[PDB]
Amino acid sequence: NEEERLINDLLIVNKYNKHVRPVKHNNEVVNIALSLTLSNLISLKETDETLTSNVWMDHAWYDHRLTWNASEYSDISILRLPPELVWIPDIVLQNNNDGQYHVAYFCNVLVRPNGYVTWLPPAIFRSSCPINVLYFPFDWQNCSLKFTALNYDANEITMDLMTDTIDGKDYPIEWIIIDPEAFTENGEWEIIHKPAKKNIYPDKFPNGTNYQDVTFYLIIRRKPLFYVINFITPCVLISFLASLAFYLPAESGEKMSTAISVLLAQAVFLLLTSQRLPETALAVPLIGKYLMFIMSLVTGVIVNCGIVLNFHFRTPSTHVLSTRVKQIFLEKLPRILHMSRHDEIKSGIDSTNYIVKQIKEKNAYDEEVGNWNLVGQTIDRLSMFIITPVMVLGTIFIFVMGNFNHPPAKPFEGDPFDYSSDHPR
Amino acid sequence: ENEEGRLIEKLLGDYDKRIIPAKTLDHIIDVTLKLTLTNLISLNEKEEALTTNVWIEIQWNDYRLSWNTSEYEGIDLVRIPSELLWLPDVVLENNVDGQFEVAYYANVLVYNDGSMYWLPPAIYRSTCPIAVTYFPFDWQNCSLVFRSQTYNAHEVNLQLSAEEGEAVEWIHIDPEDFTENGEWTIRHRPAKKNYNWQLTKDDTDFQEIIFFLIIQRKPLFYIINIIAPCVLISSLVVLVYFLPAQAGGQKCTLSISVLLAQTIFLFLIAQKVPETSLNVPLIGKYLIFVMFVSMLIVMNCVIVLNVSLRTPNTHSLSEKIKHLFLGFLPPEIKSCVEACNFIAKSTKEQNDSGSENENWVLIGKVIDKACFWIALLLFSIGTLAIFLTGHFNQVPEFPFPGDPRKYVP
Amino acid sequence: SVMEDTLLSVLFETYNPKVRPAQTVGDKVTVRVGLTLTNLLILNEKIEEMTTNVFLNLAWTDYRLQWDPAAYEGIKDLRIPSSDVWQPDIVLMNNNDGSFEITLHVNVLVQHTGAVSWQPSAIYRSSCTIKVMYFPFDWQNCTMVFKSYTYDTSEVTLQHALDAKGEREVKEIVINKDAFTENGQWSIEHKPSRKNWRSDDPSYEDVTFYLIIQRKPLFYIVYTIIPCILISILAILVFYLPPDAGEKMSLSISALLAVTVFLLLLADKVPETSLSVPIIIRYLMFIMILVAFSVILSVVVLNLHHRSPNTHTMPNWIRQIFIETLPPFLWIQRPQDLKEAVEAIKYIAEQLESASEFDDLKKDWQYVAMVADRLFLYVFFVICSIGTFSIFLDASHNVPPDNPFA
Amino acid sequence: SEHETRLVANLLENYNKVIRPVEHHTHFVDITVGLQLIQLISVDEVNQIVETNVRLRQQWIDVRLRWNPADYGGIKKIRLPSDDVWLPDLVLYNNADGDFAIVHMTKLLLDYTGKIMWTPPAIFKSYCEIIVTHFPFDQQNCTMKLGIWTYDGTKVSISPESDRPDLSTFMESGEWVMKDYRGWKHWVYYTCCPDTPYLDITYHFIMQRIPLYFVVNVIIPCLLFSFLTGLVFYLPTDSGEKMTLSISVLLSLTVFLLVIVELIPSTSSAVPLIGKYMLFTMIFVISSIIITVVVINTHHRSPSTHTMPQWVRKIFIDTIPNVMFFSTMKPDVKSAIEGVKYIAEHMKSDEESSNAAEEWKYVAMVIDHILLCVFMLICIIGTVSVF
Amino acid sequence: SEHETRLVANLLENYNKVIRPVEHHTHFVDITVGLQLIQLISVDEVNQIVETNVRLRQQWIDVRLRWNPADYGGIKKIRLPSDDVWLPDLVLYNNADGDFAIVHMTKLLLDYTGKIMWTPPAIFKSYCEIIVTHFPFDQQNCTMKLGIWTYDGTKVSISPESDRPDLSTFMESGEWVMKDYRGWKHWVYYTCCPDTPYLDITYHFIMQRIPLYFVVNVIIPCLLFSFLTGLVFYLPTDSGEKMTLSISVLLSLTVFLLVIVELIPSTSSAVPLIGKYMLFTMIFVISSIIITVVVINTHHRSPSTHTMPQWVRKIFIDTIPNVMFFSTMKRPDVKSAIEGVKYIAEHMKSDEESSNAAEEWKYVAMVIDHILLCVFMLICIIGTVSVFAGRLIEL
């Protein structure tokens, strides 16, 4: 095995110093090509605002000290060296959530006889991804992985996007690579765009380590079928039950119970929706807006059912049916709303007259009570016609505005480039 | 001057800690184990893990670390850090996490004849498959399996410690350092050397030392906080048979609410038992039973309401039904005259209809009483039976049913 | 390069990184400490810790790391692994976990004059005492105490870090617009830095960085306060329902249980310290007690409504108050056969008259119930509105001071 | 042992653990890889991660570590620390919450012919695509993709030790049952490195869930509450409790659906059959509530403002009742004279209005019996179908 | 510093850190141990673990590490990495979830006389026997047992700095109050090693819980619902809502029972007074439900089939109403027409008789409700006064 002799010559006889940049003159710059391969988008915890990714970092650079003549040795055209024996660039994830900056596994580098070193370690990265909850669950998120070289300044090593050849001309790899042989498609998040940019900040200096970085962006769209089936449909049905609660007769004794139960169910749904989102004040979630609107509407329904019940249970003994309310709720509105439609003889005479008078007063009282009942029916019919259209229109508007929300079809609004793998620039 | 310095320099000089200290080719190192339990920290039901604070005592003989005490001013015991010495890789194999080895690598007590005495502390989390059949009246049989991770039975001979010739076949418990769990009582604590006969003296898994912990749960907390409230609330169903069968009686309200309370209790139990599917916990069986009984009582309330609130308009009271349920189980003058006649007739008809309604109400009441007696019997028998079979789950008298030995010091 | 290797060999021929650089016995090493904030990640209120992603800008002078650039092909500064040079054990003293030291050990920059600069990154979890009084309309005062764990004032002199043009000290946390993510739940109001001593300990000195942050309460508003306002509206309503509806207890009890559930589920997010009751919990308790009193008064009104002569006799004071005085103020103003047939008619008439009198007394009781209910409606509306407005006005007037006092 | 000490000193004297163990660099190292499943620690459906306790058995030949047993007192095997010799870098491709490589550097067994046996333990937290279609009666298929990371096929070759993983010492789960398990070797061409193939072994375990915890804790209460749905139709309107019962049933059903939503991942690849059935049950219950409100409204219809239409009288009073069998349904004296006549007339009107109201009540009764029969038919056909 | 560099090179040139720092193997190393408490991170009552942020100050003499300042430019103190010199193996015996020994090898201070002062930090997660019997008004006494592991008293000896741990820089908890704290030294003889004593220092802290949080968030709602329990007796039976109130109170209490059980550890050594009081309140609500069901049954008793017993009438209409002073209780075809009027009159008489009997039953039910309301208010106030030995009402 001449690999042993070659490695001994390269590292021992040549006195390779792992802590010196691979340059021949101190003022030279080491070019580091960098690309990212996404093998699995493990999760996106909206509560923690964290993106967990299974990625392969691809570093490539030139080390003139690791060159050899493939003929002087046997025809050795490649060599695997551990990363703790050779100089490597310390490219770190700056926007990580936990304290994990580097790659998970420090695998061997691949060195070619011309000094071209490559390093393709795997990593589990937990980046910081602010969550835009404005259109939840019809939302798309814009996560980024920003990689910086904090060990050397921009005057000493230059980051770059890795290039690729198609017809002899080099083109940079301006996207996250998705290898079909090693990519698992997430069941909840669909990758729309995945550009990669090499940012420079001119307000800083090449003196230091904050002048450059390579950022890999990930515009992912949520698949909303799960939330539509499990959170929105039951909520909508239970909400419509409230509008239905207007059709219960006041004698049923369950108008208030029905409306209250609908409100409580909506509150439970609101709390469970709160459980699933970050506690940020940027905007109220779309479903949160819908739930607040529907809870307010159902509270109005409860109040109006209370008004209907109060009107229904009035009597002449405590209220007077005025002419205005009578002509409003028994003449105009019912038509507007198309609603349907020897002393013993003397004592006996006196007693029967008293009985007749009492029955007449009782019948008049019952007539007044019936008029009050008709007023209550008119009021709740009007309430139904006024509220149910508001409920259905609000529901449709809120859930059509959410459905009419797509990623912008191009990352970097000002950039006309597509940043797609199929059309390198 | 500390002669231990030059003694240890001599001993560890020209000493390879990677080499098993076998004097000859066929020499088998005897490694002696002894577990001292200081605290049973917890038995996490959800993850089925027993956490213990133990001192594991490991003893072997390393002939390389032997000296003549006369040459070192009578030094016959030195402490050498365990990182510098050959150790038998004795590990806890049935660990829930990846922690095979001890937590703190203490020093090794090395005696002049080569005897090595290692007593490191350890927090061990070991798998305990939990049997929920009699929760919360259950006793668990947790095990700690120790074996060498590196050397097979041809190299290292695991054994239990023996003092005064008698082997210590139990988890030792030092009175100077031991704390009662407060939820678990240690009933038996045997230890035995086991063999995997499917393997041979190679493969490193042939031999092992198993320390057992048959622990019994104290159920007073669970009784008072879960079972008594559950039984008390479940007993409320039988009250629905004394409420009136009309609007405002609220039979269905009470029944449905008791059912909902039982559901809440089911959720409560779900937070206390493991999520395994081998058996249903006894308390879970009781909860399912009472929920089913409350569903039956809801049905019976609906049926009694339907029977009681019947009218001649909708339903006809059959003579057979009435017998069964009430015999075994329990110019101007003429116009004025016509007006009076009709008034009397209408009053009589209304009164007759009222009487029929009253008969229906009586039938409902009789059904209600009979079904009350049935429901009370059913609920009482179910509760008594389930919690009596719970109360009769004794810990076995012997640690191993086959053996007649008690495995106690 | 070869020359860099030669320089490294010369510099570290006899360099001991265990030894603090004091060219003469008694010299003190001046260490400039500055903090750069890249992300305020979490302010966990339950465990009372703040998680931050920071750079720790350290600077000091090591006389042993000096060389002439002209003698080494003009090399003016080197990047060296941090473990090869002495550095002050600058740590976060008030960490919540056991992590005192940095996470990322970047290379130190050594200039030919001996000046050493080090900017290691770290994810620090620092303990923050949370003032729960105005939660969620609260501003927190979280600090990060940095000092050398090993060396005291007799050995190292902590100073403030200099700005880019090293002419003036930066007595504040530095935030880089290019690399900084806003929390979205907290806004940074002040970020001063200050050196602190101890009068009872002359060997103690640290550089403390303060983060005066203000919470954005939109989440808590939307998800806790407005629903409770709706519940309080229902509680007020319960006094408009007629007693005959048979739904007064349903409504009041539903409101009570709803507010209780809201309190139970809010108990997760508030801290568990007992130094004060947060304004949100105080509002929830106020609403819960108000709804409980609504339940009690609804029970009283129901009891009054269902009385009759057969069971109760109306006392003088009830009639005086609820029939006469209050209603004006509440605007709630309201041949043997013939002889025996005659006897039967007499009996029927007497029954009707007695029933009328009985029903009149019952109507008086029901009117008393109605008037009391209207009074309760007005009183509870006033109390609920005033209390809610007062509580939230007190919350709204809670802002961090203009002067950070540090 | 003096002989073993001398042997170990001689073996690792000039040994370089960075070089591949091959006499010639054009050869390859054949590594026999076997997986031994010790225990299935957990299966996180929500996070789609499977945590397993495994022992990764690896075998290969290192010619640099040969010796003649006769020269070392007849020693034929030794145990060496893993760190002292070249080791293959097997990586779990689908790692999700753990380590990519082996971190437990245990000792390995070395034979006098150079053969090496190394069986380090590991806790693999691998990604598991969960199929929620048949939850909680579902079976899961998720794998461990193991392959050499940096060495291609022409430098390091791995072969499966056996066609299947070793489950001889497997601890029974209590939540899952291993129906099947196998390991397949693959030659994969990656876009990084298109010239040469990289070898890997994917071990998959078909594990069927034991559906008793979720049957007891989720399905049974849901069945109870759903079965209570039909009781509403048999509850008379006069009881004033139809809406209470129906609303309680609906609220309990939605509570249990929201509980189920927490037991499964939020992926949209498949809709669980349990979730779909619960949604359909809620739709049915809400339709029943709609019809119950209609029945309640019908039962209280005042004849003053409503006259029964002919199409209702003909059908609900004359057609269904006959069809459906199982039920048991069907001076001043002149002033006094005028007063008694007025009383008689008021009884005329009261009797007529009461008759109309009773007709409305009868219509409501036949309607809810129709609904009850429909519900019983649905329940019977459903319970027969599952059997 | 050249002088310090030479000194550090000379000190460790032939220094073996495996050997005890004694000039003769007969002597013992005297180690002064002082525990400084910085912060009380947590007290996990359910898991019975106390997390504390501490500094473990240790001082001893190492005669191998002495130097003459005059030969080194007058240097009198240096900082050495703790991994370079011999360190005592001081172990936390009752560790439950953390490390047994010190893991943060911080630098130590070394005088020219050989005196060493080493104060590493540590997070101690020690086992804490939680006594849930006066929760949330309980005080806890759980400790930290520190001792040299592998050396007996004749080889390495530990002595406390002071009778109490140092809390000079202690950070106020906000959930607990430090009442007392001591450090006691023990000579323990273990069955492992019965010939020589092993030295031990057990620091213990008495923690008094501040109960405002738990009071407000748990007890006040429970007290509110318990008080509403007895209100069901003032609710008239004609309302048709008594079951609603009682059952809602019962459901609220079962939810709060869920909260309580998830609040405290499952130990059965002592019965938590909070749990016992919750069980008693549940029995209270159950008795309320039973007796109000009895009242509802009495109110609706049909006079046709039930006739009021004489004793019932006497007790509940003639004697008890007079005892309640604060209550406002009360204490040709013409023939056919003639017989029609006859029948109307007779039916009205029978109806009046039945209605009077039913009204008597309702009066009895009302009297029973008043009795029970008085009794239940008295019981509720007596209970709420005397729970937790009155500490609730005192607060």
Ligand SMILES: *[C@@H]1O[C@H](CO)[C@@H](O)[C@H](O)[C@H]1NC(C)=O
């Ligand atoms: C930073 O760059 C500026 C502009 O070239 C220069 O004036 C300054 O001296 C530099 N400082 C350092 C520390 O490199």
Ligand SMILES: C[N+](C)(C)CCOC(N)=O
């Ligand atoms: C082959 N692959 C992509 C899994 C890892 C590549 O590692 C190398 N070859 O450096």
